[PDB]
């Protein structure tokens, strides 16, 4: 509970306290009006005037409590805007300072370098897996003869109705630009 | 909970707090409008004006809370992009450094060697299993006479309708290239 | 609300595209994790057969 | 999504092909594990009969 949060709490409460006072005054206007009727019936005109004065007083008091409640509510609304924007300003100031740190220890030139390296290292890993696969391929070469694989593909293609020959080997812009590179 | 995660949490919460404030203001516009009607019916025009002023205030306050919620949400979205890309950058920097290590202790020349060796060693194992099998074959030679195996194969082929003779022994490009190697 | 709707729309395309990028990276790191394991096991087979 | 779909397609062909390679190796290491056991047992039979 901050200092301004404590004040906000107190102001919100004062506004409710005033609103309750206006309700109590409205309830007692009704109760005093009921007593004027009873006094008029009994011909007690002095007691009737005492209740009439109470009823008019309670009426007018309620309008005052109600209006001050409106005022204290407006203030409390404004103090809420100050409490929240103060919190947001503090959090932004914190984001600004933590990013000022991080962007120093990892500036753009250093990211440039890290990214370049990441790229180049995965190129070496691709070179590495190719030569592992090539080695397994030759190690197990007699377990997969070329001609047997080609014939199984042809059989499976014929059964599928695919018009292709599997023993044989199987853009224009690139060819145009190649010809330009020759012609220059 | 990182420093920026703490800030993100606070900003996401401030945005919700503001959104709730706009809902409360909308609810109280409706409640104050209801009181204007009751006051007009009773001819309390001073109380009617107090509620009218509250209703218009609560209306306009809600638009302010709503708009500030939108702003704080936008900020929190951006801080989320910073929190996540900071995590990704850290993980990439870690991948880059661990691969820098591994590619040193197992460079391409050393993989070259390991693969060559793997290949050559399984060639010796193939030489070894051939000579084990040859030895078992001769050890048990009188339990499998050639002529008996040939006759059983012929019997099984005849029963299957296969037109083949089992006692007798059973590409063009290779023969062409062989002839080229002779002719040169 | 119109400004929020257009903001949330455009934010989602950004989150989605960065997810695609981080996924691609993670796919590549999976190829490095597995081929590292295979390379270690082959190196072990090579030495035990030696 | 089109870029993700084409990436996931092409990644699967790579995973599948490397699985084939690692399987082939594992088949060969199985031949070495078993013939090593047989060679040991024969060497034992030879020495007990001697």
Swiss-Prot record, chains A, B:
Molecular function GO labels: identical protein binding; MIT domain binding; protein domain specific binding
Interaction with VPS4A, MITD1 and STAMBP: annotated segments: 171-181
Entries under PANTHER family matching the protein: CHARGED MULTIVESICULAR BODY PROTEIN
Residue ranges annotated as motif MIT-interacting motif: 171-181
Substitution effect: residue 173 to A: Abolishes interaction with SPAST and VPS4A
Protein's membrane topology: Peripheral membrane protein
Name recorded for this polypeptide: Charged multivesicular body protein 1b
Segments of this protein annotated with the region Interaction with IST1: 132-156
Annotated GO CC locations: amphisome membrane; autophagosome membrane; cytosol; endosome membrane; ESCRT III complex; extracellular exosome; kinetochore; kinetochore microtubule
Main location: cytoplasm
Biological-process GO terms, alphabetical: autophagosome maturation; autophagy; cell division; endosome transport via multivesicular body sorting pathway; ESCRT III complex disassembly; establishment of protein localization; late endosome to lysosome transport; late endosome to vacuole transport
Outcome following mutation: residue 180 to A: Abolishes interaction with VPS4B
Keyword Coiled coil applies: yes
Protein's UniProt keywords contain Transport: yes
């Amino acid at each position: 509970m901050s200092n301004m949060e404590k004040h906000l709490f107190n102001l919100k409460f004062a506004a409710k306290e005033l609103s309750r006072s206006a309700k109590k005054c409205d309830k007692e206007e009704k109760a005093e009006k009921a007593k004027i009727k009873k006094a008029i019936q009994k011909g007690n005109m002095e007691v009737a005037r005492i209740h009439a004065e109470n009823a008019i007083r309670q009426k007018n008091q309620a309008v005052n409590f109600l209006r001050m409640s409106a005022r204290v509510d407006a203030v409390a609304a404004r103090v809420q805007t100050a409490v929240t924007m103060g919190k947001v300003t503090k959090s932004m100031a914190g984001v600004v300072k933590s990013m000022d740190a991080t962007l120093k220890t990892m500036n753009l030139e250093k990211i440039s370098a890290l990214m370049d390296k990441f790229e180049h290292q995965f190129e070496t890993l691709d070179v590495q897996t190719q030569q592992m696969e090539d080695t397994v391929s030759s190690t197990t070469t007699l377990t997969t003869p070329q001609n047997q694989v080609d014939m199984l593909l042809q059989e499976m293609a014929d059964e599928a109705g695919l018009d292709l020959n599997m023993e044989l080997p199987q853009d224009e812009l690139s060819q145009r630009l190649a010809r330009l590179r020759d012609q220059v």
